[PDB]
Amino acid sequence: LMKILTERGYSFTTTAEREIVRDIKEKLCYVALDFEQEMATAASSSSLEKSYELPDGQVITIGNERFRCPEALFQPSFLGMESCGIHETTFNSIMKCDVDIRKDLYANTVLSGGTTMYPGIADRMQKEITALAPSTMKIKIIAPPERKYSVWIGGSILASLSTFQQMWISKQEYDESGPSIVHRKCF
């Protein structure tokens, strides 16, 4: 985002301005369903532009960058990484998985992490995985509203469950088996 804003004409070079650019990313960026159509719309109209006020009161205009930045998750070629996108990576993982479980892996595709908070990312993942996977596999993307906290939510659930009380590594077990007790009790 900093790179494309410098290209557009807004140069951010300091670590503090990096935080302003991160805030702009979190607030205005979004995943487009069709990158080519979105680029055409942005080039033929300004309806996709937005205004952002900097800490000094200057109002800048963010245009196609909003969806050109998050697009790097599906096409790392923009950043120059010879790696498949997130959708292709999920597809390759489901392929490496056993055939008998690919149906459930498709049906229970879940999104997590702060980076997955872009609007439309779930629809884009749905589209891509449906286009890549066999026609007989029902695709379903799960993007909870609080997916940014799903990690801690599941941790708290597992720590509050009573049946999990036998899974903890106790001080006695640690003093007896050394730090390696993690490789036996945590999986």
Place this chain on the structure above:
Amino acid sequence: WLSADFAQERRWKRGVARKVVRMVIRHHEEQRQKEERARREEQAKLRR
């Protein structure tokens, strides 16, 4: 009686020593396979 015996004992001996060095290879293989069985036990703890 004894001529065929030595000829038989030779083929038996080279067969006996043969299978001996043989299980020797399987034993060493079983030691690497012993480490692989320990890894499988780790995976079984994982599964549990």
